[PDB]
Design a protein around this motif. Structure first.
Motif, PDB file in Angstrom:
ATOM      1  N   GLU A 187       0.837  -1.203   0.000  1.00  0.00           N
ATOM      2  CA  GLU A 187       0.000   0.000   0.000  1.00  0.00           C
ATOM      3  C   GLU A 187       0.867   1.246   0.000  1.00  0.00           C
ATOM      4  O   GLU A 187       0.574   2.217  -0.706  1.00  0.00           O
ATOM      5  CB  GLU A 187      -0.947   0.038   1.228  1.00  0.00           C
ATOM      6  N   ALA A 188       1.925   1.245   0.824  1.00  0.00           N
ATOM      7  CA  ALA A 188       2.839   2.387   0.892  1.00  0.00           C
ATOM      8  C   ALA A 188       3.543   2.616  -0.448  1.00  0.00           C
ATOM      9  O   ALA A 188       3.741   3.763  -0.874  1.00  0.00           O
ATOM     10  CB  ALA A 188       3.876   2.172   2.004  1.00  0.00           C
ATOM     11  N   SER A 189       3.956   1.534  -1.109  1.00  0.00           N
ATOM     12  CA  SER A 189       4.610   1.659  -2.413  1.00  0.00           C
ATOM     13  C   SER A 189       3.691   2.331  -3.423  1.00  0.00           C
ATOM     14  O   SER A 189       4.110   3.215  -4.182  1.00  0.00           O
ATOM     15  CB  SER A 189       5.002   0.268  -2.921  1.00  0.00           C
ATOM     16  N   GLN A 190       2.431   1.903  -3.445  1.00  0.00           N
ATOM     17  CA  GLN A 190       1.441   2.466  -4.356  1.00  0.00           C
ATOM     18  C   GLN A 190       1.168   3.929  -4.051  1.00  0.00           C
ATOM     19  O   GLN A 190       0.992   4.734  -4.973  1.00  0.00           O
ATOM     20  CB  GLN A 190       0.161   1.637  -4.280  1.00  0.00           C
ATOM     21  N   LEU A 191       1.102   4.289  -2.761  1.00  0.00           N
ATOM     22  CA  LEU A 191       0.867   5.680  -2.387  1.00  0.00           C
ATOM     23  C   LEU A 191       1.969   6.605  -2.878  1.00  0.00           C
ATOM     24  O   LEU A 191       1.726   7.803  -3.061  1.00  0.00           O
ATOM     25  CB  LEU A 191       0.725   5.823  -0.871  1.00  0.00           C
ATOM     26  N   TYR A 239       8.356  -2.035  -4.162  1.00  0.00           N
ATOM     27  CA  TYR A 239       9.291  -0.945  -3.873  1.00  0.00           C
ATOM     28  C   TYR A 239       9.837  -1.008  -2.444  1.00  0.00           C
ATOM     29  O   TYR A 239      11.053  -1.032  -2.228  1.00  0.00           O
ATOM     30  CB  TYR A 239       8.605   0.394  -4.116  1.00  0.00           C
ATOM     31  N   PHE A 240       8.952  -1.002  -1.447  1.00  0.00           N
ATOM     32  CA  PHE A 240       9.450  -0.992  -0.076  1.00  0.00           C
ATOM     33  C   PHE A 240      10.030  -2.343   0.338  1.00  0.00           C
ATOM     34  O   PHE A 240      11.005  -2.388   1.103  1.00  0.00           O
ATOM     35  CB  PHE A 240       8.345  -0.540   0.885  1.00  0.00           C
ATOM     36  N   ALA A 241       9.438  -3.455  -0.121  1.00  0.00           N
ATOM     37  CA  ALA A 241      10.065  -4.759   0.118  1.00  0.00           C
ATOM     38  C   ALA A 241      11.515  -4.788  -0.379  1.00  0.00           C
ATOM     39  O   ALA A 241      12.390  -5.377   0.273  1.00  0.00           O
ATOM     40  CB  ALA A 241       9.261  -5.876  -0.549  1.00  0.00           C
ATOM     41  N   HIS A 242      11.792  -4.152  -1.529  1.00  0.00           N
ATOM     42  CA  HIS A 242      13.159  -4.146  -2.059  1.00  0.00           C
ATOM     43  C   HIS A 242      14.093  -3.296  -1.202  1.00  0.00           C
ATOM     44  O   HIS A 242      15.245  -3.685  -0.944  1.00  0.00           O
ATOM     45  CB  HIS A 242      13.167  -3.662  -3.511  1.00  0.00           C
ATOM     46  N   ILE A 243      13.623  -2.134  -0.756  1.00  0.00           N
ATOM     47  CA  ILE A 243      14.452  -1.296   0.115  1.00  0.00           C
ATOM     48  C   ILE A 243      14.727  -2.011   1.432  1.00  0.00           C
ATOM     49  O   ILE A 243      15.876  -2.075   1.901  1.00  0.00           O
ATOM     50  CB  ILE A 243      13.773   0.063   0.342  1.00  0.00           C
ATOM     51  N   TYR A 244      13.674  -2.565   2.040  1.00  0.00           N
ATOM     52  CA  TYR A 244      13.829  -3.293   3.295  1.00  0.00           C
ATOM     53  C   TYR A 244      14.849  -4.415   3.142  1.00  0.00           C
ATOM     54  O   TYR A 244      15.717  -4.604   3.993  1.00  0.00           O
ATOM     55  CB  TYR A 244      12.480  -3.857   3.747  1.00  0.00           C
ATOM     56  N   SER A 293       5.534   7.203   9.199  1.00  0.00           N
ATOM     57  CA  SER A 293       6.877   6.977   8.694  1.00  0.00           C
ATOM     58  C   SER A 293       6.912   7.044   7.175  1.00  0.00           C
ATOM     59  O   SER A 293       7.962   7.353   6.611  1.00  0.00           O
ATOM     60  CB  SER A 293       7.442   5.641   9.207  1.00  0.00           C
ATOM     61  N   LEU A 294       5.778   6.815   6.506  1.00  0.00           N
ATOM     62  CA  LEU A 294       5.730   7.080   5.073  1.00  0.00           C
ATOM     63  C   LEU A 294       5.932   8.565   4.795  1.00  0.00           C
ATOM     64  O   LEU A 294       6.629   8.934   3.844  1.00  0.00           O
ATOM     65  CB  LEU A 294       4.405   6.587   4.477  1.00  0.00           C
TER      66      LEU A 294
END
Length: 115
Positions: free
Chosen positions: A67-71, A78-83, A108-109
């Motif tokens: 959801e955060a990646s889409q926002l 996107y965020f899974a890759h950064i994490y 935090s977003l």
DNA sequence: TAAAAGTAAATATGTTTAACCTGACATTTCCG
DNA sequence: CGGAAATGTCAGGTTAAACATATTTACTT
């Protein structure tokens, strides 16, 4: 309002934390077992039921990484890759990996956007 | 020298489902 | 331009939750 990521658990984690079988709180959630559920803050977010003992934890602050990646206008991972690959980029960004689902918070977003 | 048997609810077990992260690699963007 | 960093694709594997079914508990006759 606010959330303490040190006090939140999946249904399976909280089930074993209170000394019950791995599927205890999921069965209680699915079958509307209010006598069990009324003791907790809980909310199903994405594919994970988040539980907390602390009634002051606003679990609606949690947002899935997808959801955060889409926002942000980004790809779903996107965020899974950064994490997973660039975790220094999440320093100061509240997040919690719970096994099936990675979560950020609404706050935090916003911090990440500013970065 | 009470126990057995029944029971519905609570709880546990085994299996599958869907989420969504992982992982290898490609492509685009940044900035010298 | 050019290398590095950021961000993208997508099959597939690992997970918590769901599901289906069984066992245990608590209790009554």
């Amino acid at each position: 309002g606010k959330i303490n990521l040190n006090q939140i658990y999946t249904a399976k984690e909280m089930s074993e934390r209170i000394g019950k079988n791995r599927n205890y709180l999921s069965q209680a959630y699915r079958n509307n077992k209010h006598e069990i559920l009324k003791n907790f803050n809980y909310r199903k977010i994405g594919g994970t039921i988040i539980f907390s003992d602390n009634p002051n934890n606003d679990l609606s602050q949690l947002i899935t990484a997808k959801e955060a990646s889409q926002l942000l206008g980004k790809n779903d991972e996107y965020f899974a890759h950064i994490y997973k690959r660039f975790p220094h980029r999440l320093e100061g960004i509240d997040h919690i990996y719970t096994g099936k689902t990675l979560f950020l918070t609404k706050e935090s977003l916003e911090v990440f956007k500013k970065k």
